[PDB]
Design a protein around this nucleic acid. Sequence first.
RNA 1: GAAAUGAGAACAGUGUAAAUCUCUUAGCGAGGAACAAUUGGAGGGCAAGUCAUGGUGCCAGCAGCCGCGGUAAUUCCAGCUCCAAUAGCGUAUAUUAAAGUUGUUGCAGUUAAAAAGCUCGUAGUUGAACUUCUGUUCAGGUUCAUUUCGAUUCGUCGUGUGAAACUGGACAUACGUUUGCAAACUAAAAUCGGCGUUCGACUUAGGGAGUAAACAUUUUACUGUGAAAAAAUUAGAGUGUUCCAGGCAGGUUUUAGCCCGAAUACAUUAGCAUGGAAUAAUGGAAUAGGACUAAGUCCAUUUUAUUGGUUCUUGGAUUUGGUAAUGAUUAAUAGGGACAGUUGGGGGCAUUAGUAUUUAAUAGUCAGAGGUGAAAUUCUUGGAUUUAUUAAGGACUAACUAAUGCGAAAGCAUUUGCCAAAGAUGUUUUCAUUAAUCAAGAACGAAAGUUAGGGGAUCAAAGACGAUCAGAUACCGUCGUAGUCUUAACUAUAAACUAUACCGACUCGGGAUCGGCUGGAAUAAAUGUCCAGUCGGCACCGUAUGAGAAAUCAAAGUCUUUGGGUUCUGGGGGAAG
Lengths: 129, 150, 97, 141, 80
Amino acid sequence: VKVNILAECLKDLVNAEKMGKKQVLLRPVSKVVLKFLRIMQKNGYIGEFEVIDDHRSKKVVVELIGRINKCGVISPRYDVPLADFEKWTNNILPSRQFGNVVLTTTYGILTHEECRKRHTGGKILGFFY
Amino acid sequence: MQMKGKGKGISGSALPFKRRSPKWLHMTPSTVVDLSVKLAKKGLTPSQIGVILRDQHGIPQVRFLTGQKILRILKKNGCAPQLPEDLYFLIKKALSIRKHLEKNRKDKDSKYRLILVESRIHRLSRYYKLNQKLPPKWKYNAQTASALVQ
Amino acid sequence: MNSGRANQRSKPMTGLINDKKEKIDAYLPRKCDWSNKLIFSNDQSSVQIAIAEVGENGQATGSKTNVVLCGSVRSKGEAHIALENILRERGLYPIQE
Amino acid sequence: GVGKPRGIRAGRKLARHRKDQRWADNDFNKRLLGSRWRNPFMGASHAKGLVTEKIGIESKQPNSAVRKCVRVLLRKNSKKIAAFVPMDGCLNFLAENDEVLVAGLGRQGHAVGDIPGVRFKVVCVKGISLLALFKGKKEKR
Amino acid sequence: ERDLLNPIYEEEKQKNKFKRLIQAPNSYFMDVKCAQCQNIQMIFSNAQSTIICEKCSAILCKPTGGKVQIQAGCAFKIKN
RNA sequence: GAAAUGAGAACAGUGUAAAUCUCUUAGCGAGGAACAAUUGGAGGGCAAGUCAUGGUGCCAGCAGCCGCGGUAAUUCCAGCUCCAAUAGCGUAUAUUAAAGUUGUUGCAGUUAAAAAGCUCGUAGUUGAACUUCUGUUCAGGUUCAUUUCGAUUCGUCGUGUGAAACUGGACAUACGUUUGCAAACUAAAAUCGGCGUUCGACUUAGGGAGUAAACAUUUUACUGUGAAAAAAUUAGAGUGUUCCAGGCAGGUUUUAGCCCGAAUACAUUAGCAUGGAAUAAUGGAAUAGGACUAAGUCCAUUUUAUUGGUUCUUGGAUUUGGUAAUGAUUAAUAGGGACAGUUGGGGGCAUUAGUAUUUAAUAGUCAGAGGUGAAAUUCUUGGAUUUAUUAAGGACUAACUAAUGCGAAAGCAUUUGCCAAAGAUGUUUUCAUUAAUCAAGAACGAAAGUUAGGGGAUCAAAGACGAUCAGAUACCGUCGUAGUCUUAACUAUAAACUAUACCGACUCGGGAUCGGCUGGAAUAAAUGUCCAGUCGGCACCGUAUGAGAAAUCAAAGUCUUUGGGUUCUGGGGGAAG
Ligand SMILES: [Mg+2]
Ligand SMILES: [Mg+2]
Ligand SMILES: [Mg+2]
Ligand SMILES: [Mg+2]
Ligand SMILES: [Mg+2]
Ligand SMILES: [Mg+2]
Ligand SMILES: [Mg+2]
Ligand SMILES: [Mg+2]
Ligand SMILES: [Mg+2]
Ligand SMILES: [Mg+2]
Ligand SMILES: [Mg+2]
Ligand SMILES: [Mg+2]
Ligand SMILES: [Mg+2]
Ligand SMILES: [Mg+2]
Ligand SMILES: [Mg+2]
Ligand SMILES: [Mg+2]
Ligand SMILES: [Mg+2]
Ligand SMILES: [Mg+2]
Ligand SMILES: [Mg+2]
Ligand SMILES: [Mg+2]
Ligand SMILES: [Mg+2]
Ligand SMILES: [Mg+2]
Ligand SMILES: [Mg+2]
Ligand SMILES: [Mg+2]
Ligand SMILES: [Mg+2]
Ligand SMILES: [Zn+2]
């Protein structure tokens, strides 16, 4: 069946920027899918976006700037102590210059980087660069 | 698409947007609740009752109008169909198969088909039992089926 | 939704700037306008169109507008629709009498 | 997904799988099955022995030659060994019944491309390194 | 080039029930007026059964996959 | 050509329990076989001979793997000259890396090794979406920006804006309540002064804020500190002659005393304290009952000296009445059921044909039939082959029958009638996570084959014969038993093939199909035709700045920009399934 729609939505989107789509329609959407989205948006990867009210679980449409190179999730969302960071930064990110490894915390959801600010982080969620 | 590594499609049914009751219709929740329980008393499936209220008395979605789902309405009014359509029917055909098999003790495609159908029933029991929506000592074997036949 | 579009072209494009705020990237590459991809150092099939500016009397003005169209987009037979739109954007495709 | 399962709750599975699918390695399968202990040296690096006789063996495929070899009897092990006597005149020093020290040739298994069923090298005669006997100014008895 | 938020009416009218954005059905409801009694009964565009006129007992609709053929000359308004 | 100098060897001194040695140091101590470099190579990998060098002649031997060697060897023996590491350098064995060649990160699985023949299915693994969003203002830093300000220099601070976000407050139907403390301000009342009021100081009430304890279903997980011995690893100070490293040491110019040190970090797994808002799991009110509140009643009970009896505080049990918007998220282009016409060579019982092959009757002739490249055993006037009619029998379903249909797969095509089943489509029907895949564990699974009965027409393994060949118990030909058909048991494999696991989402173009549906047009009013949609099903065409070793792949794609869920499998070849 379906799982981690964040992943469903995410790749559907990558496939977008990769194919050169002008905009994308993500079918199954959730708070997570949206938060991640406004985090990419806030950092300037995706453009303006609209959430249509599917009386079941909303559908979102994201405008595509053309700067997204890749944005995926990470299989089981392992736990990650602040000490476990460089491991993943050198692992997932294409450089020490596009630090975008989204994590889930108790302090909500922060950028790979913000988690060092707040000083907590926790489970990995996804990445984008 | 259930027990099918190969076959799969989309039957239909998509509740329209507007969550309110149709304009043209006037019927205090109660009005319907009567028809519903009356119809039910005659011996009807909440599954079938709803069908009437749509085909016959233009009530698209009883839930939207009452703020009550059929089976609930029925249960509140003592008119609750003991065993759920779900299980009931599966067991029905599950049985029909057995009868046919007897006089055709050789029909293999049917032995198989029953195996699948009996398999499902064990899946519902697991479920309906876990939602304390069916006594734990429930057991469909051959006697549970013939028990309902009487 | 012009939204995102206006904002990406917004500020100037400037490559790897160091602490000493110096530009270093040997050269700043052309970017495909309808896609925002980078035009190679050897992108064979990518082209730069030159369209001319007219001056309210049927005459032509010593002024041209350019449109960079990357390789792939030109290859998927987009260009014609791509261009016809970069021209809507820079207010021009619709040509009034 | 691929074959391997990606669950945070399914570590056990992956674990047992690796321990299992791992027997497919010979290097593993080898030391794991106390195989090293059953060879003629009993794991050992070297072994002493008595010369049972100097025999010669023929080269294989594109080579044709009389290889010098000594049949040795290992001490505590007590096995018949096929041992190749190195360099030129070498066998001229090995007197029958003397004590010899033998070691393998490139990873215990395949003999040098040329040799047939020989898996050992001879390094000492009466406890005198061969090389030593090979160069005049060194030693001789 | 097309906007996915302000899609053409026609396009969405062609697409499959479940493909449209807001996603709504095709079925509708109709007041039928018997060929005799005249009584006006409501019937669903996809009746899954034969329908009688509660007044006399005439035959109004025959069931099919999807459409419901209306018996003889009976009246029908599409309530909406 | 003279200076230099440890090895060396030494009276002394230091050191020592003594002794040896080191260290300081006088007399003595270096010029070519000396006072001294080896070890291992010089085709490739693997740094270094293009010597026209001598010996050897597939011999002796080399060679880690390629390979050297059979009279002109670049790998042997040896000379010479070169290279490498150098007081060191070869070798053998186990082991680390190279090994993304055991792979969680990070492999492979059409053809190279590798998807099981196929379905069901408890363990296991994996699971859709909703529940304070949000706004305003204040404040502390933080950053970053700066058509900018004050300071300092060899690079920082302060100030202002904007901005973001953090934080923390507050307030907004909005993360708490009590306590005690502190308290910050305000509304009244008192007292005091001047002239009831103008005003001021001082009291009660009031919450923020400010701490500590009690609460927010239970964990996971994350922060943080308590705990995690020393030595070791990292690491600060520190010229042990550098260094290994010890933990000492620094200044006599305050010297019967001075200065300074023996720091720090990491320590995952399980336990403890604790801050927490995300994901994830778990839970609360649905038979009803819950919640809050008042009273009544009953049981239990602390302090009242203690024992009773009342009362009463405090818990618990009920009944009642009051209060509260009384209490059950949507309905997953998830899944299960109901229902509706319909579709199919899906299946099981019946039934029913049709030619043909044999074989038989009834007639009919006449000498050859049959078979091969040629012929030959074969058959035949006790009539063959042949023609007509008809019958018996066992199997088989032609032509229509095609990249078309159904079935989990194996497999399934004469008619008709029953028996239970299935997809897809259609749904403003219910049910509402019921689900994906799966060790165990089961259902199937052409042939061939097996047991016990049937049946026995055709073809036919073994066999018997002809021919062919140098040979033919083989490829052709004549016959023929088992089987092939069936009932009931048993057997499970097959290039059980798309050699490409199932569920899911995406992404190029295009028509034509099979099934269902919806609009429309002509005829006509047809279970038809066409136009246009569209779900679902075989399949094809074109093409990819996507994949590959390539053949090729619309998936064999969305994998170094390496991670949707799950099952099975492989790890040089042969011996070997
Ligand atoms: Mg589906
Ligand atoms: Mg060879
Ligand atoms: Mg002395
Ligand atoms: Mg000299
Ligand atoms: Mg040498
Ligand atoms: Mg040599
Ligand atoms: Mg040499
Ligand atoms: Mg020579
Ligand atoms: Mg070496
Ligand atoms: Mg190996
Ligand atoms: Mg509050
Ligand atoms: Mg049939
Ligand atoms: Mg014949
Ligand atoms: Mg017949
Ligand atoms: Mg057909
Ligand atoms: Mg036929
Ligand atoms: Mg069986
Ligand atoms: Mg038999
Ligand atoms: Mg002959
Ligand atoms: Mg025959
Ligand atoms: Mg029509
Ligand atoms: Mg059509
Ligand atoms: Mg590959
Ligand atoms: Mg193709
Ligand atoms: Mg991979
Ligand atoms: Zn009527």
